[PDB]
Amino acid sequence: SVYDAAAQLTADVKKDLRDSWKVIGSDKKGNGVAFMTTLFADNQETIGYFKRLGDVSQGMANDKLRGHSITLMYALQNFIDQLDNPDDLVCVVEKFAVNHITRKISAAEFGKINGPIKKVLASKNFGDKYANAWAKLVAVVQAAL
Amino acid sequence: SVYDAAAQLTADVKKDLRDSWKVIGSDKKGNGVAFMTTLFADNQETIGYFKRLGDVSQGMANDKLRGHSITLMYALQNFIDQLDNPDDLVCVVEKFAVNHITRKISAAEFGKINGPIKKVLASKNFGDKYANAWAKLVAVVQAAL
Ligand code: HEM
Numbered sequence: 001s002v003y004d005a006a007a008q009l010t011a012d013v014k015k016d017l018r019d020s021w022k023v024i025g026s027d028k029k030g031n032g033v034a035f036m037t038t039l040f041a042d043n044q045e046t047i048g049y050f051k052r053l054g055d056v057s058q059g060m061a062n063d064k065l066r067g068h069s070i071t072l073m074y075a076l077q078n079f080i081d082q083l084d085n086p087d088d089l090v091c092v093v094e095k096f097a098v099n100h101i102t103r104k105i106s107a108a109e110f111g112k113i114n115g116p117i118k119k120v121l122a123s124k125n126f127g128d129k130y131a132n133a134w135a136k137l138v139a140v141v142q143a144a145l
Numbered sequence: 146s147v148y149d150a151a152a153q154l155t156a157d158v159k160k161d162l163r164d165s166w167k168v169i170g171s172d173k174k175g176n177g178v179a180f181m182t183t184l185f186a187d188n189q190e191t192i193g194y195f196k197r198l199g200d201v202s203q204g205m206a207n208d209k210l211r212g213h214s215i216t217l218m219y220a221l222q223n224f225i226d227q228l229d230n231p232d233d234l235v236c237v238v239e240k241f242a243v244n245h246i247t248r249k250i251s252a253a254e255f256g257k258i259n260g261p262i263k264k265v266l267a268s269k270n271f272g273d274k275y276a277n278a279w280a281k282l283v284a285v286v287q288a289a290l
């Protein structure tokens with residue numbers, strides 16, 4: 001199933017992912033926090049999963065949230081680096097899913113990250129074309145949940 | 146404390162970490178798997194913590210082990226990237242510690258990774274000077290467990 005989702009990552013899709021990541025990944029702390037604070041603002045209900053982070057309204061200044069946000073970006077870095085080898089992408093995606101499955105995060109719940117990603121990409125001037133590419137990457141993860 | 150341990154990362158220690166990582170981080174899959182197989186060989190008692198991975202003697206052929214090994218390298222990449230800012234290094238280290246604390250991995254247990262790191266580093270022509278540099282980085286994580 002994960003392999004089938006990975007099949008949607010065509011040559012053009014992988015190219016758009018790498019080009020956008022070249023910019024997005026250049027500031028992991030800034031964009032990582034941007035992803036999270038946008039998620040919490042557009043889908044307040046997701047905050048229920050992050051009680052451990054404490055006062056998330058503090059944003060960047062919250063050490064726990066900042067730590068989580070930076071770390072989140074290295075999972076994407078991992079995914080992006082394995083794009084040319086389906087076997088490695090799949091094993092890393094399934095490895096990543098383990099803890100999220102334990103947390104009872106469904107594919108539908110995980111999909112809520114698409115909105116924030118689209119908004120952050122747009123703030124960097126990466127249009128719908130790029131948003132659709134990232135949605136496909138997220139779909140690979142969703143297939144493992 | 147983790148804040149006191151982070152201060153132990155002096156100028157030259159950070160420099161040796163970067164120079165060695167430039168080579169070691171070049172092949173995350175190969176070196177990551179080497180780290181793990183060496184750990185399981187020198188400390189068979191730690192295999193119990195990785196029951197989910199299955200037959201760990203299969204090495205590279207074991208998809209779950211390969212997935213974990215590659216992922217492990219991105220945590221180190223994270224640490225190396227935060228060396229410039231002690232505040233970020235600390236929040237990233239504490240974030241990383243959460244799941245290991247939940248698994249009841251003690252500071253002493255975590256320290257068993259020092260052997261494997263020294264051996265892989267030696268196989269790449271990086272001697273004691275570098276092994277000790279990495280031990281100091283590992284000590285920062287140990288302080289958070
Ligand atoms: C593309 C998006 C995402 C990425 C790359 C990502 C990445 C990560 C990473 C690397 C970790 C640390 C390792 C672990 O514990 O598994 C993590 C932890 C976690 N993730 Fe995900 N995640 C994403 C989306 C989500 C979403 C949408 C939710 C919830 C609706 C979620 C909830 C969690 C929680 C609760 C933790 C633990 C936080 C803590 O207490 O420190 N993740 N995630």
Ligand code: HEM
Nearest residue numbers: 099191194195197213216217220221244245250254255258
């Ligand atoms: C250089 C040291 C190490 C690094 C960088 C590292 C990194 C990681 C990462 C990134 C994960 C995935 C995220 C998570 O679930 O927390 C993880 C999982 C894990 N780590 Fe650590 N780790 C290290 C050493 C150890 C040691 C020494 C043990 C115990 C003897 C250990 C036991 C575990 C276990 C059991 C898992 C879950 C494996 C699975 O079911 O997939 N780790 N570690």
